[PDB]
Amino acid sequence: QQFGRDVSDFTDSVRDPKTSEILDISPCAFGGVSVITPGTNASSEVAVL
Amino acid sequence: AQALNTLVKQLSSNFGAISSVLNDILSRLDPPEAEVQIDRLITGRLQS
Ligand SMILES: *[C@@H]1O[C@H](CO)[C@@H](O[C@@H]2O[C@H](CO)[C@@H](O[C@@H]3O[C@H](CO)[C@@H](O)[C@H](O[C@H]4O[C@H](CO)[C@@H](O)[C@H](O)[C@@H]4O)[C@@H]3O)[C@H](O)[C@H]2NC(C)=O)[C@H](O)[C@H]1NC(C)=O
Ligand SMILES: *[C@@H]1O[C@H](CO)[C@@H](O)[C@H](O)[C@H]1NC(C)=O
C-alpha cells in the first residue's frame, strides 16, 4: 500500500515514505457561523455558535 | 442518502472534460489562460 481513500475520492490514509507509518488525513476546520441576538432594540450584545 | 451519494459522484464526474483534479490542471496546464477551463468546470458543479 501507499495511501488509501475513503468512499469518496479524497485521500484517507497515507504511509510514511521514510518510516512507514500508518497515518490518516482529516480536514482542517470549517463550518457555519451562527449569531444569536436578543434584538437591537432590547440589547446590543451578541453571542456566537 | 441516494441524493447525497449522487452529489458525491458529481465531484468525480469531470465537467470541463480536460482535467480530473484542480491540482492537476494547475500543474499540467499553464496558469495565465487555462483558468478558463476551471470556470467551465466549476459552473457545472455549481448547477449540480
Ligand atoms: C530510511 O532511513 C531511516 C534513517 O534515516 C530509517 O529510519 C530508522 O529506522 C530504524 C528502525 O526502524 C530506527 O532504528 C532504531 O533506532 C533506535 C534508537 O536510535 C535503536 O535503539 C534501534 O535499535 C534496535 O534495532 C536494531 C536493529 O534491529 C538492533 O540492532 C538494536 O539492538 C535494537 O534492537 C533501531 O536501530 C531509526 O531510529 C530510524 N531513524 C530515523 C532517522 O527515522 C528507515 O528505517 C529507513 N527506511 C527504509 C525503507 O530504508
Ligand atoms: C423599542 O423598545 C422600546 C422598549 O422600551 C419600545 O417602547 C419601542 O416601541 C421599541 N421600538 C419599536 C420601533 O418598536
Curated annotation (Swiss-Prot), chain B:
Residues 1-38 form a coiled coil. Acts as a viral fusion peptide which is unmasked following S2 cleavage occurring upon virus endocytosis. This is Spike protein S2'. The lineage of its organism: Viruses, Riboviria, Orthornavirae, Pisuviricota, Pisoniviricetes.
